[PDB]
Nucleic acid binder design. Structure first.
Length: 78
DNA sequence: TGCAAAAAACGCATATTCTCTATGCAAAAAACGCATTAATACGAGAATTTTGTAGCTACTTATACAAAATTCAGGAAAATTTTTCTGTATAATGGGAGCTGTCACGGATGCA
């Protein structure tokens, strides 16, 4: 009869996964920083964002391939 | 304790006489008339004269334009206070607080 308990009760078991993945995340920490940071630097030069996936990265990036950078880089910071 | 009865008083004979009711005297008030003088008012004269009426004149104001010399309402800076946002780096690893003595009712489920 409790959502606080819920928090327990499903995350009391959640751990910290140590601080090793910090760098594994670091790779992504950036990478995301990038992926956006570009993509809005590119908002910001023009089109206020063409809503284009490739522009989601200043460097080239095959759609699915870069789709793996995000989502993976995201679960990293998730 | 009945009166018969005597002397002096107390009652039928007038002087006295003395408050007393009664008219003429007289003296000064008063008020009436002779009346005299003065004053209260009528007659005339022309003098002031204020009020009543006209026109001129000076003051006072009816009015028509408006920016006087001053008031105010925003507009846009500061000025300082205050508000919202962002940031500060050891480790820290499952939450307390009453419900347990109410009676009775009406469904609504579970549990063989």
């Amino acid at each position: 009869e409790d959502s606080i308990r819920l928090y327990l009760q499903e995350i009391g078991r959640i751990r910290l996964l140590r601080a090793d993945e910090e760098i594994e995340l670091a790779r992504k920490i950036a990478d995301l920083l990038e992926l956006e940071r570009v993509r809005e630097r590119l908002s910001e030069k023009l089109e206020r964002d063409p809503r284009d996936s490739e522009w989601a990265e200043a460097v080239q990036l095959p759609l699915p391939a870069f789709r793996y950078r995000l989502h993976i880089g995201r679960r990293a910071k998730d």
